[PDB]
């Protein structure tokens, strides 16, 4: 009811002691959360986003309580605390208190070595939110220290970890790719080839988008040779997504540069790469249109 009233009217009429009582009430409500009350998490996000810049005196108390609950025995408590970080990163960055958000990013970088998959996916989503609301230049720890830490996490087999980490890698490669050398990006592409054999279609779609972002960053030649070798090398219930990635790379990187190698790949008699060349051509034409 409080979330619906705040989303309907707003938080303009809230008094200062009333705001302190609301912050204490929602902190005790989050402190006693036995079930998976995600609508209560959305209500928390709605109340603090309606408050906006008035939560700046209450921010270190919220940060201290969340960082205390991140050391809990239960995995669900740590998952809920990282979800609260992911909800409140935007309103933490509205006041431009970059020291507290950078400290939270440093603590989450320390927490990146967790073994539980739901907790690790929640930490990755919170880090993705923090990078989206801060920007690359004032991001402590830096991207040149962050992405090598994210490189072995792509070898994980759990779906939520893969989805959140591929989303973070895609946000970095679309936005802040200048900090990372091309050798590391080629290592990312070689990991993304193994990531293409997943089960959720959103994981494969975001994988194809990361392939397009890396080819826009570093150049469309070596990644195209890697994708062509994967197309001629797979022979399984995948590799249509390899053709989708080839078409996305060509559409993002001026398809005159891609079409000689794709045309010369048709001469290989290996009975499956020609169908991949034709499927990539069809997806390329559907992507480029006129």
């Amino acid at each position: 009811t409080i979330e619906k009233i705040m989303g309907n009217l707003g938080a303009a009429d809230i008094d200062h002691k009333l705001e302190e009582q609301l912050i204490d009430g929602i902190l005790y409500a989050f402190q006693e959360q036995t079930t998976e009350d995600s609508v209560m998490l959305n209500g928390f996000g709605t109340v603090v986003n309606a408050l906006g810049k008035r939560v700046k005196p209450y921010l270190p108390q919220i940060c201290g309580t969340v960082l205390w609950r991140l050391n809990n025995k239960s995995a669900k408590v740590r998952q809920q605390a990282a979800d609260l970080i992911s909800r409140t990163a935007v309103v933490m960055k509205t006041c431009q208190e970059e020291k507290l958000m950078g400290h939270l990013g440093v603590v989450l970088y320390e927490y990146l070595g967790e073994e539980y998959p739901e907790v690790l996916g929640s930490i990755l989503g919170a880090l993705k939110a923090i990078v989206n609301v801060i920007g690359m230049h004032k991001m402590t720890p830096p991207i040149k220290d962050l992405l090598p830490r994210l490189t072995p996490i792509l070898k994980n087999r759990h779906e939520k970890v893969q989805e959140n980490c591929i989303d973070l890698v895609g946000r970095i490669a679309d936005r802040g790719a200048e900090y990372v050398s091309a050798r590391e990006w080629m290592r990312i592409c070689f990991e993304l080839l193994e990531l293409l054999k997943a089960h959720k279609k959103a994981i494969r779609r975001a994988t194809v988008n990361t392939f397009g972002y890396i080819a826009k960053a570093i150049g469309p030649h070596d990644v195209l040779a890697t994708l062509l070798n994967n197309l001629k090398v797979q022979e399984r219930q995948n590799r249509v997504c390899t053709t989708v990635a080839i078409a996305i790379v060509a559409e993002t990187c001026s398809p005159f540069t891609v079409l000689p190698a794709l045309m010369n790949e048709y001469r290989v008699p290996e009975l499956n790469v020609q169908n991949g060349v034709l499927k990539s051509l069809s997806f390329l034409f559907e992507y480029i249109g006129e």
């Binding site: 050391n71 809990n72 025995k73 320390e110």
Partner: protein
């Protein structure tokens, strides 16, 4: 890593002492796994960043109270980054230039309360901050602090701009802190509270503690009546500690319409419901006002007085529990209770009316007509406890306190309806027999029920027997 104070001892048979990279950690012999764990904790210049953040936090504190101690200016010593690693010699970290000639005492410990201050005088001041990684043999911080202070002031290699100053030593391996050196007046409780706040909530110290916790993979699983009015007679001494009467001032008026404030003596109440003993720790008339941090430093002085009274008391005289109220100034009380941890401070479902605890004539006359910390003790139910049990006398004392907090005239009429209820001078309650105190408690409960029905706009007799007994004992109703 978990037994690293014991494995990495300083007192060994043979060993070439070497310093670990970018730290002040000393190793005697190449132990590779310990070196790997301690390097993995202290990566990316964590030692220098911890020292820098502590220096900036102390600079922010001294800039926030620049005017209060006649300080002209504060200088951050922009120094080489290798100052935090060198244990052989140390420069100064924070420079203080004063407005006037500061009176400076001889060097002493941070915990030294007694300090005759008129040794010498000077203007400039230096503060040094030292970080150590103590082991099991040498986790003492105070003797390290005074030894480092003497070996840095006497030796010519350490450069200090003033002969008088202070050195602060922090042991990160045991999370201890101390200081040794000269003092100018007002600085000592400021540095004590600032160091308590810094070791409470430094960000880089939290980064270090989180790295240690993730290295060890540790987790914290922890995030009559059954309340405190009844648990005192349950073979557990629960002493209610109240410090809300420490900030007490009397009422007075001047010749004009404006009124002045009389600095009355502060009182700290320690009530034992299992024995009826109320100890009123008194304060001086010049200590309740004028000094800074009236809600913090006066509470810290009351906590120090309570810790001194607990240490003066025996082990059986010390309480096994503390029936505390809601915490408003109990952070320095819990910080200063390291030497007296036998009583656990917690907030149960039963409270006590401590504001009526000064309602006694003898205790009020002893507290008001004094100017020194006498720390007196009286009996709540001096004669009513011999005609009842421990819980019944505790409930009768709580009902008398609730009646005195409700209406003093009705409580005096119920307790002392005539001149035959005159007790001894050490007794707070009125003189009564068993049936006379039973009738006085019945009249006090009737007056308290009438006052509760007048305040809550309800009937006095509409409550249940358990609710009336909980309201008499001070619990929730």
């Amino acid at each position: 890593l978990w037994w690293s104070p014991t494995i990495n001892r300083a007192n060994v048979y043979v060993g070439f002492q070497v310093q670990l990279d970018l730290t002040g950690i000393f190793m005697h012999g190449k132990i590779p796994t310990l070196k790997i764990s301690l390097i993995q904790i202290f990566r990316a210049h964590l030692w220098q960043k911890i020292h820098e953040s502590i220096v900036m936090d102390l600079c922010q504190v001294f800039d926030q109270e620049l005017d209060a101690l006649e300080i002209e200016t504060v200088q951050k010593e922009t120094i080489h980054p290798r100052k935090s690693y060198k244990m052989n010699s140390s420069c100064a970290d924070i420079l203080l230039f004063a407005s006037y000639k500061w009176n400076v005492s001889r060097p002493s410990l941070l915990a030294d309360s007694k300090d005759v201050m008129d040794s010498t005088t000077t203007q400039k001041y230096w503060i040094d901050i030292q970080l150590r990684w103590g082991d099991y043999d040498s986790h003492d911080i105070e003797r390290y602090a005074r030894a480092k202070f003497l070996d840095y002031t006497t030796d010519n290699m350490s450069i200090y701009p003033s002969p008088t100053g202070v050195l602060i030593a922090i042991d990160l391996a045991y999370n201890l802190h101390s200081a040794y050196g000269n003092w100018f007046p007002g600085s000592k409780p400021l540095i004590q509270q600032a160091m308590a706040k810094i070791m409470k909530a430094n960000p880089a110290l939290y980064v270090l503690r989180e790295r240690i916790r993730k290295g060890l993979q540790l987790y914290s699983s922890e995030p009559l009546s059954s309340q405190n009015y009844g648990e005192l007679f349950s073979n557990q001494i629960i002493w209610f500690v109240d410090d809300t009467n420490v900030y007490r001032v009397t009422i007075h008026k001047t010749f004009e319409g404006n009124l002045t404030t009389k600095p009355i003596n502060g009182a700290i109440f320690i009530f034992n419901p299992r024995t009826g003993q109320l100890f009123l720790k008194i304060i001086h008339t010049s200590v309740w006002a004028g000094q800074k941090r009236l809600g913090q430093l006066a509470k810290w002085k009351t906590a120090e007085e309570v810790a001194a009274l607990i240490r003066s008391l025996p082990v059986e005289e010390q309480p096994k529990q503390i029936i505390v109220t809601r915490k408003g100034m109990l952070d320095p009380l819990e910080v200063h209770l390291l030497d007296f941890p036998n009583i656990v401070i917690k907030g149960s479902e039963l409270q006590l009316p401590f504001q009526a605890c000064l309602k006694v004539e003898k205790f009020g006359d002893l507290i008001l007509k004094a100017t020194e910390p006498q720390m007196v003790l009286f009996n709540l139910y001096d004669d009513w406890l011999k005609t009842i049990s421990s819980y019944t006398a505790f409930s009768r004392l709580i009902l008398i306190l609730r009646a005195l907090h409700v209406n003093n005239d009705r409580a005096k009429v119920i307790l002392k309806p005539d001149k035959t209820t005159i007790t001894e001078p050490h007794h707070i309650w009125p003189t009564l027999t068993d049936e006379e105190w039973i009738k006085v408690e019945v009249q006090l409960k009737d007056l308290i029920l009438a006052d509760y029905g007048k305040k809550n706009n309800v009937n006095v007799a509409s409550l249940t027997q358990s609710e009336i007994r909980d309201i008499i004992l001070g619990m929730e109703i």
